[PDB]
PDB file of C-alpha atoms and ligand atoms in Angstrom:
ATOM      1  CA  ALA A   1     106.572 103.550  95.464  1.00  0.00           C
ATOM      2  CA  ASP A   2     108.691 100.895  93.412  1.00  0.00           C
ATOM      3  CA  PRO A   3     110.917  98.607  95.988  1.00  0.00           C
ATOM      4  CA  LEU A   4     114.768  99.287  95.411  1.00  0.00           C
ATOM      5  CA  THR A   5     114.827  95.836  93.199  1.00  0.00           C
ATOM      6  CA  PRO A   6     118.254  95.119  90.864  1.00  0.00           C
ATOM      7  CA  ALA A   7     116.038  95.970  87.644  1.00  0.00           C
ATOM      8  CA  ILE A   8     114.931  99.346  89.656  1.00  0.00           C
ATOM      9  CA  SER A   9     118.810 100.365  90.526  1.00  0.00           C
ATOM     10  CA  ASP A  10     119.512  99.804  86.892  1.00  0.00           C
ATOM     11  CA  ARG A  11     116.949 102.200  85.661  1.00  0.00           C
ATOM     12  CA  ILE A  12     117.796 104.437  88.184  1.00  0.00           C
ATOM     13  CA  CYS A  13     121.657 104.178  87.711  1.00  0.00           C
ATOM     14  CA  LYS A  14     121.104 104.888  83.979  1.00  0.00           C
ATOM     15  CA  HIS A  15     119.236 107.807  84.000  1.00  0.00           C
ATOM     16  CA  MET A  16     121.240 109.321  86.935  1.00  0.00           C
ATOM     17  CA  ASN A  17     124.549 109.103  84.832  1.00  0.00           C
ATOM     18  CA  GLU A  18     123.328 110.767  82.024  1.00  0.00           C
ATOM     19  CA  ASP A  19     121.114 113.475  83.969  1.00  0.00           C
ATOM     20  CA  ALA A  20     122.797 114.473  87.320  1.00  0.00           C
ATOM     21  CA  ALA A  21     126.765 112.865  86.019  1.00  0.00           C
ATOM     22  CA  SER A  22     127.348 116.459  87.843  1.00  0.00           C
ATOM     23  CA  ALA A  23     125.745 115.262  91.154  1.00  0.00           C
ATOM     24  CA  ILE A  24     127.756 111.765  91.121  1.00  0.00           C
ATOM     25  CA  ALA A  25     130.940 113.365  90.810  1.00  0.00           C
ATOM     26  CA  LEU A  26     130.086 115.942  93.879  1.00  0.00           C
ATOM     27  CA  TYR A  27     128.993 112.565  95.743  1.00  0.00           C
ATOM     28  CA  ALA A  28     132.524 111.226  95.124  1.00  0.00           C
ATOM     29  CA  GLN A  29     134.089 114.683  96.105  1.00  0.00           C
ATOM     30  CA  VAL A  30     132.222 115.144  99.404  1.00  0.00           C
ATOM     31  CA  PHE A  31     130.890 111.979 100.990  1.00  0.00           C
ATOM     32  CA  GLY A  32     133.269 109.546  98.807  1.00  0.00           C
ATOM     33  CA  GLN A  33     136.427 112.049 100.091  1.00  0.00           C
ATOM     34  CA  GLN A  34     137.571 111.601  96.688  1.00  0.00           C
ATOM     35  CA  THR A  35     140.367 114.519  95.091  1.00  0.00           C
ATOM     36  CA  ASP A  36     140.512 115.464  91.612  1.00  0.00           C
ATOM     37  CA  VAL A  37     137.522 113.930  90.694  1.00  0.00           C
ATOM     38  CA  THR A  38     137.315 113.922  86.542  1.00  0.00           C
ATOM     39  CA  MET A  39     134.288 111.809  86.017  1.00  0.00           C
ATOM     40  CA  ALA A  40     132.101 109.729  88.354  1.00  0.00           C
ATOM     41  CA  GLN A  41     129.054 107.111  87.175  1.00  0.00           C
ATOM     42  CA  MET A  42     126.960 105.044  89.388  1.00  0.00           C
ATOM     43  CA  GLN A  43     127.109 101.979  89.269  1.00  0.00           C
ATOM     44  CA  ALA A  44     124.321 100.148  91.744  1.00  0.00           C
ATOM     45  CA  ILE A  45     121.922 101.384  94.516  1.00  0.00           C
ATOM     46  CA  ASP A  46     120.090  99.312  97.217  1.00  0.00           C
ATOM     47  CA  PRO A  47     118.748  99.911 100.284  1.00  0.00           C
ATOM     48  CA  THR A  48     121.627 100.505 102.448  1.00  0.00           C
ATOM     49  CA  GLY A  49     124.073 102.357  99.952  1.00  0.00           C
ATOM     50  CA  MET A  50     125.220 103.005  96.458  1.00  0.00           C
ATOM     51  CA  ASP A  51     128.558 102.084  94.620  1.00  0.00           C
ATOM     52  CA  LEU A  52     130.439 104.718  92.794  1.00  0.00           C
ATOM     53  CA  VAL A  53     132.852 104.632  89.780  1.00  0.00           C
ATOM     54  CA  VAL A  54     135.413 107.318  90.242  1.00  0.00           C
ATOM     55  CA  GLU A  55     137.645 108.197  87.598  1.00  0.00           C
ATOM     56  CA  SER A  56     140.892 109.846  89.211  1.00  0.00           C
ATOM     57  CA  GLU A  57     144.439 110.569  88.095  1.00  0.00           C
ATOM     58  CA  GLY A  58     144.070 107.925  85.228  1.00  0.00           C
ATOM     59  CA  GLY A  59     142.711 105.566  88.210  1.00  0.00           C
ATOM     60  CA  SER A  60     139.548 104.035  88.160  1.00  0.00           C
ATOM     61  CA  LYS A  61     138.114 102.981  91.699  1.00  0.00           C
ATOM     62  CA  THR A  62     134.923 101.862  93.124  1.00  0.00           C
ATOM     63  CA  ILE A  63     134.178 103.063  96.294  1.00  0.00           C
ATOM     64  CA  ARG A  64     130.864 102.913  98.170  1.00  0.00           C
ATOM     65  CA  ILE A  65     128.498 105.174 100.134  1.00  0.00           C
ATOM     66  CA  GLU A  66     126.405 103.830 102.864  1.00  0.00           C
ATOM     67  CA  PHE A  67     123.101 105.963 103.834  1.00  0.00           C
ATOM     68  CA  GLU A  68     123.113 106.817 107.057  1.00  0.00           C
ATOM     69  CA  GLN A  69     119.098 105.840 106.848  1.00  0.00           C
ATOM     70  CA  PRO A  70     118.328 102.747 105.175  1.00  0.00           C
ATOM     71  CA  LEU A  71     115.840 103.265 102.059  1.00  0.00           C
ATOM     72  CA  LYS A  72     112.503 101.526 101.556  1.00  0.00           C
ATOM     73  CA  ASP A  73     111.433 102.567  97.996  1.00  0.00           C
ATOM     74  CA  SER A  74     112.578 104.566  94.965  1.00  0.00           C
ATOM     75  CA  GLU A  75     110.685 107.422  96.669  1.00  0.00           C
ATOM     76  CA  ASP A  76     112.685 107.334  99.529  1.00  0.00           C
ATOM     77  CA  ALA A  77     116.246 107.008  97.281  1.00  0.00           C
ATOM     78  CA  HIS A  78     114.969 110.025  95.315  1.00  0.00           C
ATOM     79  CA  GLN A  79     114.558 112.271  98.425  1.00  0.00           C
ATOM     80  CA  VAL A  80     117.844 111.495  99.865  1.00  0.00           C
ATOM     81  CA  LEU A  81     119.854 111.833  96.273  1.00  0.00           C
ATOM     82  CA  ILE A  82     118.253 115.575  95.925  1.00  0.00           C
ATOM     83  CA  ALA A  83     119.107 116.250  99.389  1.00  0.00           C
ATOM     84  CA  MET A  84     122.627 114.777  99.135  1.00  0.00           C
ATOM     85  CA  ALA A  85     123.087 116.833  95.911  1.00  0.00           C
ATOM     86  CA  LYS A  86     122.106 120.256  97.612  1.00  0.00           C
ATOM     87  CA  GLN A  87     124.642 119.224 100.624  1.00  0.00           C
ATOM     88  CA  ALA A  88     127.121 118.607  98.125  1.00  0.00           C
ATOM     89  CA  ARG A  89     126.816 121.704  96.115  1.00  0.00           C
ATOM     90  CA  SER A  90     126.839 123.654  99.038  1.00  0.00           C
ATOM     91  CA  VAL A  91     130.169 122.594 100.472  1.00  0.00           C
ATOM     92  CA  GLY A  92     131.874 122.515  96.731  1.00  0.00           C
ATOM     93  CA  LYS A  93     131.050 126.382  95.921  1.00  0.00           C
ATOM     94  CA  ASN A  94     132.959 127.298  99.109  1.00  0.00           C
TER      95      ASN A  94
ATOM     96  CA  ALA B   1     107.094 103.862  77.166  1.00  0.00           C
ATOM     97  CA  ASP B   2     104.054 105.662  78.749  1.00  0.00           C
ATOM     98  CA  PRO B   3     102.002 107.901  76.644  1.00  0.00           C
ATOM     99  CA  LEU B   4     101.982 111.450  77.391  1.00  0.00           C
ATOM    100  CA  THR B   5      98.612 111.637  79.126  1.00  0.00           C
ATOM    101  CA  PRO B   6      97.508 114.629  81.662  1.00  0.00           C
ATOM    102  CA  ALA B   7      98.291 112.624  84.827  1.00  0.00           C
ATOM    103  CA  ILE B   8     101.745 111.748  83.484  1.00  0.00           C
ATOM    104  CA  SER B   9     102.119 115.529  82.695  1.00  0.00           C
ATOM    105  CA  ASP B  10     100.933 116.306  86.366  1.00  0.00           C
ATOM    106  CA  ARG B  11     104.002 113.845  87.380  1.00  0.00           C
ATOM    107  CA  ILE B  12     106.377 115.505  85.210  1.00  0.00           C
ATOM    108  CA  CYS B  13     105.926 118.921  85.938  1.00  0.00           C
ATOM    109  CA  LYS B  14     106.032 118.096  89.603  1.00  0.00           C
ATOM    110  CA  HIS B  15     109.411 116.456  89.860  1.00  0.00           C
ATOM    111  CA  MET B  16     110.618 118.766  87.439  1.00  0.00           C
ATOM    112  CA  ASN B  17     109.789 121.661  89.594  1.00  0.00           C
ATOM    113  CA  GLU B  18     110.974 120.228  92.286  1.00  0.00           C
ATOM    114  CA  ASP B  19     114.369 118.928  91.011  1.00  0.00           C
ATOM    115  CA  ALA B  20     115.023 120.847  88.045  1.00  0.00           C
ATOM    116  CA  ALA B  21     113.616 124.236  88.697  1.00  0.00           C
ATOM    117  CA  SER B  22     116.909 125.464  87.661  1.00  0.00           C
ATOM    118  CA  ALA B  23     116.411 124.137  84.187  1.00  0.00           C
ATOM    119  CA  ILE B  24     113.095 125.121  83.592  1.00  0.00           C
ATOM    120  CA  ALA B  25     114.592 128.905  84.471  1.00  0.00           C
ATOM    121  CA  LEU B  26     117.013 128.409  81.422  1.00  0.00           C
ATOM    122  CA  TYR B  27     114.053 126.926  79.253  1.00  0.00           C
ATOM    123  CA  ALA B  28     112.226 130.374  79.698  1.00  0.00           C
ATOM    124  CA  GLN B  29     115.767 132.507  79.215  1.00  0.00           C
ATOM    125  CA  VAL B  30     117.109 130.138  76.215  1.00  0.00           C
ATOM    126  CA  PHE B  31     114.152 129.117  74.058  1.00  0.00           C
ATOM    127  CA  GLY B  32     111.092 131.312  75.130  1.00  0.00           C
ATOM    128  CA  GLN B  33     113.676 134.451  75.095  1.00  0.00           C
ATOM    129  CA  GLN B  34     113.137 135.558  78.436  1.00  0.00           C
ATOM    130  CA  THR B  35     114.977 138.178  79.706  1.00  0.00           C
ATOM    131  CA  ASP B  36     115.762 138.267  83.575  1.00  0.00           C
ATOM    132  CA  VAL B  37     113.982 135.438  84.652  1.00  0.00           C
ATOM    133  CA  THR B  38     113.485 135.107  88.431  1.00  0.00           C
ATOM    134  CA  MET B  39     111.231 131.698  88.767  1.00  0.00           C
ATOM    135  CA  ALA B  40     110.239 129.559  86.324  1.00  0.00           C
ATOM    136  CA  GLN B  41     108.160 126.856  86.932  1.00  0.00           C
ATOM    137  CA  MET B  42     106.527 124.105  84.534  1.00  0.00           C
ATOM    138  CA  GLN B  43     102.569 124.176  84.151  1.00  0.00           C
ATOM    139  CA  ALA B  44     102.126 121.348  81.424  1.00  0.00           C
ATOM    140  CA  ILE B  45     103.828 119.229  79.021  1.00  0.00           C
ATOM    141  CA  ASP B  46     102.099 117.612  75.762  1.00  0.00           C
ATOM    142  CA  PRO B  47     103.987 115.861  72.781  1.00  0.00           C
ATOM    143  CA  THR B  48     103.483 119.203  70.728  1.00  0.00           C
ATOM    144  CA  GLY B  49     105.053 121.723  73.546  1.00  0.00           C
ATOM    145  CA  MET B  50     105.069 122.572  77.538  1.00  0.00           C
ATOM    146  CA  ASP B  51     103.595 125.694  79.421  1.00  0.00           C
ATOM    147  CA  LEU B  52     105.821 127.634  81.565  1.00  0.00           C
ATOM    148  CA  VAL B  53     104.814 130.150  84.142  1.00  0.00           C
ATOM    149  CA  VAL B  54     107.853 133.051  84.224  1.00  0.00           C
ATOM    150  CA  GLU B  55     108.442 135.343  86.843  1.00  0.00           C
ATOM    151  CA  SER B  56     110.155 138.276  85.972  1.00  0.00           C
ATOM    152  CA  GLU B  57     110.269 140.854  88.211  1.00  0.00           C
ATOM    153  CA  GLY B  58     106.299 140.592  88.966  1.00  0.00           C
ATOM    154  CA  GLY B  59     105.531 139.450  85.457  1.00  0.00           C
ATOM    155  CA  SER B  60     103.536 135.984  85.940  1.00  0.00           C
ATOM    156  CA  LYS B  61     103.547 135.340  82.285  1.00  0.00           C
ATOM    157  CA  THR B  62     102.809 132.005  80.853  1.00  0.00           C
ATOM    158  CA  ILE B  63     104.721 131.382  77.969  1.00  0.00           C
ATOM    159  CA  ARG B  64     104.444 128.022  75.010  1.00  0.00           C
ATOM    160  CA  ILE B  65     107.200 125.922  73.949  1.00  0.00           C
ATOM    161  CA  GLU B  66     106.611 124.159  71.119  1.00  0.00           C
ATOM    162  CA  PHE B  67     108.920 121.301  70.388  1.00  0.00           C
ATOM    163  CA  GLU B  68     110.443 120.436  67.009  1.00  0.00           C
ATOM    164  CA  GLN B  69     109.584 117.199  66.987  1.00  0.00           C
ATOM    165  CA  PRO B  70     106.276 115.686  68.645  1.00  0.00           C
ATOM    166  CA  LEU B  71     107.104 113.801  71.497  1.00  0.00           C
ATOM    167  CA  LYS B  72     105.854 110.157  71.407  1.00  0.00           C
ATOM    168  CA  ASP B  73     106.322 108.752  74.946  1.00  0.00           C
ATOM    169  CA  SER B  74     107.913 109.289  78.320  1.00  0.00           C
ATOM    170  CA  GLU B  75     110.781 108.234  77.374  1.00  0.00           C
ATOM    171  CA  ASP B  76     111.124 110.511  74.476  1.00  0.00           C
ATOM    172  CA  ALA B  77     109.818 113.647  76.575  1.00  0.00           C
ATOM    173  CA  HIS B  78     112.737 112.730  79.119  1.00  0.00           C
ATOM    174  CA  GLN B  79     115.170 112.763  76.560  1.00  0.00           C
ATOM    175  CA  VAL B  80     113.956 115.679  75.189  1.00  0.00           C
ATOM    176  CA  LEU B  81     113.940 117.660  78.328  1.00  0.00           C
ATOM    177  CA  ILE B  82     117.628 116.769  79.056  1.00  0.00           C
ATOM    178  CA  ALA B  83     118.746 117.733  76.058  1.00  0.00           C
ATOM    179  CA  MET B  84     117.201 121.003  76.117  1.00  0.00           C
ATOM    180  CA  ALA B  85     118.610 121.578  79.467  1.00  0.00           C
ATOM    181  CA  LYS B  86     122.219 120.916  78.000  1.00  0.00           C
ATOM    182  CA  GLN B  87     121.413 122.906  75.152  1.00  0.00           C
ATOM    183  CA  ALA B  88     120.257 126.000  77.242  1.00  0.00           C
ATOM    184  CA  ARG B  89     122.953 125.719  79.578  1.00  0.00           C
ATOM    185  CA  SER B  90     125.829 125.312  76.153  1.00  0.00           C
ATOM    186  CA  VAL B  91     124.387 128.680  75.132  1.00  0.00           C
ATOM    187  CA  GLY B  92     124.586 130.199  78.697  1.00  0.00           C
ATOM    188  CA  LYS B  93     128.454 129.530  78.630  1.00  0.00           C
ATOM    189  CA  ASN B  94     128.362 131.370  75.802  1.00  0.00           C
ATOM    190  CA  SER B  95     128.278 135.302  77.556  1.00  0.00           C
ATOM    191  CA  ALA B  96     127.076 138.375  76.117  1.00  0.00           C
ATOM    192  CA  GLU B  97     128.251 141.388  77.458  1.00  0.00           C
ATOM    193  CA  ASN B  98     127.292 144.937  76.382  1.00  0.00           C
ATOM    194  CA  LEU B  99     130.234 146.744  74.862  1.00  0.00           C
ATOM    195  CA  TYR B 100     132.537 149.858  75.273  1.00  0.00           C
ATOM    196  CA  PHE B 101     135.447 151.191  74.146  1.00  0.00           C
ATOM    197  CA  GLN B 102     138.765 152.756  75.674  1.00  0.00           C
TER     198      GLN B 102
HETATM  199  C1  LIG C 201     115.009 108.461  90.824  1.00  0.00           C
HETATM  200  C2  LIG C 201     113.878 109.101  90.687  1.00  0.00           C
HETATM  201  C3  LIG C 201     113.391 110.171  89.225  1.00  0.00           C
HETATM  202  C4  LIG C 201     112.669 109.555  88.265  1.00  0.00           C
HETATM  203  C5  LIG C 201     111.554 108.795  87.984  1.00  0.00           C
HETATM  204  C6  LIG C 201     113.208 111.123  87.356  1.00  0.00           C
HETATM  205  C7  LIG C 201     112.155 111.148  86.298  1.00  0.00           C
HETATM  206  C8  LIG C 201     112.297 112.123  85.590  1.00  0.00           C
HETATM  207  N1  LIG C 201     113.350 113.172  85.231  1.00  0.00           N
HETATM  208 FE1  LIG C 201     114.840 113.171  86.737  1.00  0.00          FE
HETATM  209  N2  LIG C 201     116.253 113.474  88.229  1.00  0.00           N
HETATM  210  C9  LIG C 201     116.667 112.503  89.539  1.00  0.00           C
HETATM  211  C10 LIG C 201     115.220 111.360  89.896  1.00  0.00           C
HETATM  212  C11 LIG C 201     114.647 111.278  89.232  1.00  0.00           C
HETATM  213  N3  LIG C 201     113.946 112.046  87.667  1.00  0.00           N
HETATM  214  C12 LIG C 201     117.116 113.155  90.101  1.00  0.00           C
HETATM  215  C13 LIG C 201     118.236 112.787  91.325  1.00  0.00           C
HETATM  216  C14 LIG C 201     117.959 114.402  89.759  1.00  0.00           C
HETATM  217  C15 LIG C 201     119.172 115.239  90.093  1.00  0.00           C
HETATM  218  C16 LIG C 201     119.120 116.284  90.237  1.00  0.00           C
HETATM  219  C17 LIG C 201     120.181 117.377  90.535  1.00  0.00           C
HETATM  220  O1  LIG C 201     121.461 117.120  89.392  1.00  0.00           O
HETATM  221  O2  LIG C 201     120.340 117.629  91.208  1.00  0.00           O
HETATM  222  C18 LIG C 201     116.938 114.617  88.559  1.00  0.00           C
HETATM  223  C19 LIG C 201     117.555 115.852  87.523  1.00  0.00           C
HETATM  224  C20 LIG C 201     116.533 115.811  86.800  1.00  0.00           C
HETATM  225  C21 LIG C 201     117.116 116.731  85.250  1.00  0.00           C
HETATM  226  C22 LIG C 201     117.933 117.810  85.885  1.00  0.00           C
HETATM  227  C23 LIG C 201     118.958 117.513  85.030  1.00  0.00           C
HETATM  228  C24 LIG C 201     119.944 118.747  84.670  1.00  0.00           C
HETATM  229  O3  LIG C 201     121.136 118.718  85.014  1.00  0.00           O
HETATM  230  O4  LIG C 201     119.239 119.421  83.659  1.00  0.00           O
HETATM  231  C25 LIG C 201     115.455 116.733  84.530  1.00  0.00           C
HETATM  232  C26 LIG C 201     115.661 117.894  83.202  1.00  0.00           C
HETATM  233  C27 LIG C 201     114.782 115.441  84.706  1.00  0.00           C
HETATM  234  C28 LIG C 201     113.963 115.045  83.906  1.00  0.00           C
HETATM  235  C29 LIG C 201     112.938 114.255  84.183  1.00  0.00           C
HETATM  236  C30 LIG C 201     112.223 113.398  83.346  1.00  0.00           C
HETATM  237  C31 LIG C 201     111.526 113.924  82.623  1.00  0.00           C
HETATM  238  C32 LIG C 201     111.718 112.291  84.192  1.00  0.00           C
HETATM  239  C33 LIG C 201     110.153 111.677  84.275  1.00  0.00           C
HETATM  240  C34 LIG C 201     110.485 110.345  82.977  1.00  0.00           C
HETATM  241  N4  LIG C 201     115.508 115.198  85.954  1.00  0.00           N
END
């Protein structure tokens, strides 16, 4: 139940970039409305949103995705990210 | 750098059964040599191995997967589990098919 400190953010991003690099690209494609996503890495996460580095058509744009509900702790972030991954996977397969 | 205590095992297994249920089935399929796995849940994890409950059309079999290298801490476990999931996915991409001739 750790608060979303910058130290926690770097930890979440570090692990998210290696374990769920697939989900990060889906975030950029579905919620970030990015086409032709090659790679996507998480740069930061805070209570109100997350920042993604999206590689596309030989170009590295950084986008920001705002959570509808503000996050309070690490567990809150965990639950939103898992749900967003499911929502993204459903839309991508269709 | 948390040691792999029984309390840590319960936490890892809980999260792995929630966010990684797909990868635990690949563990049963690839490393556990189980064919036609319906569901697979992780029951326990310790430095020398992990215990899986594998359901295969009403089988509910408990198998044990022994790690090549003993785990040292929770970070080591984290790394090992990810590589095993990637490896399991890779072998799955090299698909096998019964072969028949014209
Ligand atoms: C933040 C919070 C968190 C935490 C603490 C964690 C922790 C963890 N984890 Fe995690 N994960 C996560 C969040 C997380 N996580 C996510 C979000 C994901 C995603 C899922 C998907 O992909 O969708 C994962 C995912 C995951 C997976 C899957 C991947 C693949 O692809 O296969 C695995 C195996 C893991 C492991 C793990 C471990 C061992 C641990 C302990 C250290 N993970």
